[PDB]
């Protein structure tokens, strides 16, 4: 029962039938259908062969629209007449007209209210956009309703930026320039977002806290929940998502100053006037957000495959199960992959095989509401994972395109993937007879090494956050995605829309379910190697190179102002010395492993412990400034996220516009000192024990 025995039990037909099963009825967090799906998944995993499958439930705060009083945006004239209403519901896709329990598009946790005022265009609603708006063109956004497009920055940052500018309310729309791909038809003819299409999402700023009412501790049945006023990241002004048919037919009358540049203008046939006023100007818009926030229960599925030799070691494979409406891509295209992997491991166990280490299979809940399922489970099991967790693998949205296989993980995994992809067959068009490694390298080369595929950084934003930004467990993700040099749009056009159906995947994305098969193969090989290898496939020499690169980047970001560094005596020599010591100690450790004999079990356990706890050595118990739950000194999210060393980046952001330069540069020095100490301590953990 080697790697091939498990690898050849993966079949595309099973993935296809599982995906068809999942994407039929709405599966929203806190709804009954999600509970039924969780029960079905638990029963199927028990059938597959896992020793024990159980349900973990948490009571967390979610938000729902008021079905009796649906949310909408209207235009009222001078005498109180609704001369204009937006769509109350996204038009259902063909074949799903009779499907019920489809919540209309809405922004989760949006505060209730009835704001009314003039409109103003703020483009992507980034900080620079408000900078150009009011500090340059002299247009105060206070007491106004801002209109923004979906874009690169996360929507919670958009709403907070609108909040600090005093805006009455925010209106987010998915511009065709950012989502409507050229040439391809709209759904159901193609896969583009139609005018009725609206993108749902949550607009809070949790900063890795999980449940807004129970930050840092699990939301059990005896948890104490803070007041709504003192919550974490809850917005203060109403926000509502809108499709571009409503918007194009909304901002025609908007009149005022000309757009600052072509960047502000999108693709609609709208003048895109930035100044306040409707030019037909006495009328004003009014929003009717009636959303309600309540505490509801969410359920996570946890299945166990106990190890044979090392039951103390946990290798976790997981993903979320909730969806906004259907989830043909996010997340059921990954849930089917997880189901197939679990079935393969179960039949492998049934023939008599059993891995050295424990394997935990996870199905998360309330992830679209702020990662409220994985975070709470990790908070409950913080100690077990801290002292035992080897690695975590996240499976979600196996398909986002049909061009390349993207992988993002900690550097310790870099070598392992290169060994894994060299065996699996490439499913790409052409490239017949080649391994997955060859196709991946050809279609996504690394800038540093021509013959090596590029592996991206593990940027936060999904279920791996609590396992990598707070606990410090080596996390990895692999999924098929599109070209980046030719496809300008971000994600897929039908993201968080109502048209994420099984027909979409079966027709335009994965007709033969071969990319699903190869993504399942990648994830399953990752878990199998991590749970069955004698020596953990971790390489610190891969971490050293990226440490050097990150230090070189942050040094330039600081050296942006050389005369200011010289005036206040800012130096990076401690960080450079720590990184150099890391490289030397990692070299010695690698040679020790190569010399090492594997017959003696206890010393093998010691060596594997040294390999395992390397990632935990980058965790600062005090966390980043004002963000207690972002603790990974190297990869924690920045306060201006989209670079590594978040502390130094945060201290170096907007230092020119500071009242007291000495205090700011002292903070920069403090962050440099913290980073250097953490790197040196991580290096010292790998030195000769005793």
């Amino acid at each position: 029962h080697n790697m091939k025995a498990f690898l050849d039990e993966l079949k595309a037909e099973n993935i296809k039938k599982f995906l068809y099963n999942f994407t039929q009825i709405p599966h929203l967090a806190g709804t009954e259908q999600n509970f039924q799906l969780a029960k079905q998944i638990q029963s199927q995993w028990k059938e597959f062969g896992l020793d024990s499958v159980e349900l973990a439930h948490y009571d967390v705060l979610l938000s729902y629209p008021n079905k009796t009083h649906p949310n909408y945006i209207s235009i009222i004239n001078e005498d109180g007449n609704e001369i204009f209403n937006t769509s109350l519901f996204e038009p259902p896709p063909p074949g799903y007209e009779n499907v019920s329990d489809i919540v209309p598009p809405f922004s989760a946790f949006s505060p209730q209210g009835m704001p009314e005022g003039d409109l103003v265009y703020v483009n992507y609603a980034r900080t620079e956009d408000f900078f150009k708006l009011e500090r340059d063109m002299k247009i105060n956004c206070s007491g106004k309703i801002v209109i923004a497009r979906y874009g690169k920055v996360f929507r919670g940052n958009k709403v907070k930026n609108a909040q600090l500018a005093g805006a009455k309310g925010v209106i987010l729309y998915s511009d065709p320039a950012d989502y409507f791909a050229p040439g391809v038809k709209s759904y159901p003819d193609g896969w583009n977002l139609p005018g009725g299409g609206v993108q749902r999402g949550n607009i809070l700023n949790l900063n890795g806290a999980g449940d807004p009412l129970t930050p840092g501790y699990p939301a059990n049945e005896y948890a104490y929940r803070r007041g709504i006023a003192e919550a974490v990241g809850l917005p203060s002004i109403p926000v509502h998502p809108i499709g571009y048919y409503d918007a194009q037919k909304l901002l025609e009358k908007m009149g005022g100053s000309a757009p600052p540049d072509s960047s502000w203008r999108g693709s609609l046939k709208v003048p895109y006037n930035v100044g306040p006023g409707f030019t037909f100007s006495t009328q004003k818009v009014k929003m009717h957000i009636h959303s309600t926030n309540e505490v509801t229960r969410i359920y996570n599925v946890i299945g166990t495959l106990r190890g044979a030799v090392e039951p103390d070691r946990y290798v976790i494979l997981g993903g979320h199960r909730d969806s906004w409406v259907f989830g043909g891509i996010d997340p059921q295209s990954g849930a089917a992959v997880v189901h197939e992997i679990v079935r393969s491991f179960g039949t492998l166990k049934k023939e008599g095989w059993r891995p050295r280490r424990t394997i935990l299979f996870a199905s998360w809940d309330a992830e679209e509401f702020g990662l409220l399922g994985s975070t709470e489970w990790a908070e409950e099991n913080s100690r077990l994972l801290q002292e035992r967790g080897v690695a975590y693998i996240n499976a979600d949205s196996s398909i986002e395109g049909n061009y390349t296989l993207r992988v993002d993980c900690t550097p310790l995994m870099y070598s392992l993937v290169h060994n894994l992809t060299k065996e699996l067959k490439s499913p790409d068009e052409g490239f017949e007879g080649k391994s997955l490694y060859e196709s991946w390298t050809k279609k996504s080369p690394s800038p540093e090494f021509s013959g090596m595929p590029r592996i991206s950084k593990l940027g936060s934003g999904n279920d791996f956050e609590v396992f990598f930004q707070r606990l410090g467990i080596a996390s990895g993700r692999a999924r098929y995605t599109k070209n980046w040099e030719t496809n300008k749009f971000s994600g897929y056009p039908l993201y968080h829309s109502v048209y994420e159906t099984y027909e979409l995947v079966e027709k335009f994305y994965d007709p033969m379910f071969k990319y699903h098969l190869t993504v399942a193969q990648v994830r399953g090989g990752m878990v199998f190697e991590l749970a069955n290898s004698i020596v953990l496939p971790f390489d610190c020499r891969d971490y050293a190179v990226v440490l050097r690169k990150y230090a070189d980047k942050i040094y330039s970001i600081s050296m942006k102002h050389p005369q200011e560094m010289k005036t206040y005596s800012v130096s990076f020599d401690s960080l450079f010395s720590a990184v150099k010591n890391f490289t030397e100690i990692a070299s010695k450790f690698s040679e020790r492993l190569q010399d090492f004999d594997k017959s003696n079990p206890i010393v093998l356990r010691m060596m594997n412990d040294q390999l395992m706890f390397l990632e935990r050595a980058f965790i600062d118990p005090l966390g980043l400034p004002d963000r207690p739950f972002y603790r990974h000194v190297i990869y924690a999210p920045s306060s201006h996220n989209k670079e590594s060393f978040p502390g130094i980046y945060d201290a170096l952001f907007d230092i020119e516009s500071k009242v007291d330069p000495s205090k700011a540069w002292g903070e920069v020095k403090r962050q440099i000192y913290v980073a250097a100490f953490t790197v040196q301590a991580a290096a010292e953990t790998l030195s000769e024990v005793a």
Epitope: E448, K549, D552, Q563, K566
Partner: nanobody
């Protein structure tokens, strides 16, 4: 904030030998990723040439190779390009880019990897 005061642009016939200098004040006592990016009229920005002072290795693009050379000035914080035998259709505004490095393992060849930028100018006629 430093603006890498640079000069050396011009407009001559194709095949001419031009020389563009770029210096980074405050970078005299440090290594960096000195490099250049072209901006054709209507096209995008692409890598052209660069030097890694940490290892002192100079690299050029496949098309650029054999036509561009980099020379270091007496002052450490200053590099020169000599463009000899300019092709008829290399008319593109040059952008000098540089990021300070200490270990200086690899030379970035992407625009987004460079921190502090400049505004050059270059036009070549037939």
């Amino acid at each position: 904030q430093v603006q890498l005061q640079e000069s050396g642009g011009g407009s001559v016939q194709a095949g001419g030998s031009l020389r563009l200098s770029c210096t980074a004040p405050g970078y005299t006592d440090s290594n960096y990723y000195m490099s250049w990016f072209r901006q054709a009229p209507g096209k995008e920005r692409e890598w052209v040439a660069g030097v890694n002072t940490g290892r002192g290795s100079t690299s050029y693009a496949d098309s650029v190779k054999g036509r561009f050379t980099i020379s270091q000035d007496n002052a450490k914080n200053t590099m020169f390009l000599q463009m000899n035998s300019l092709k008829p259709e290399d008319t593109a505004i040059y952008y000098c880019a540089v990021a300070a490095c200490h270990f200086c393992d690899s030379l970035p060849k992407t625009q987004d990897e460079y921190i502090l930028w400049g505004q050059g100018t270059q036009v070549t006629v037939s």
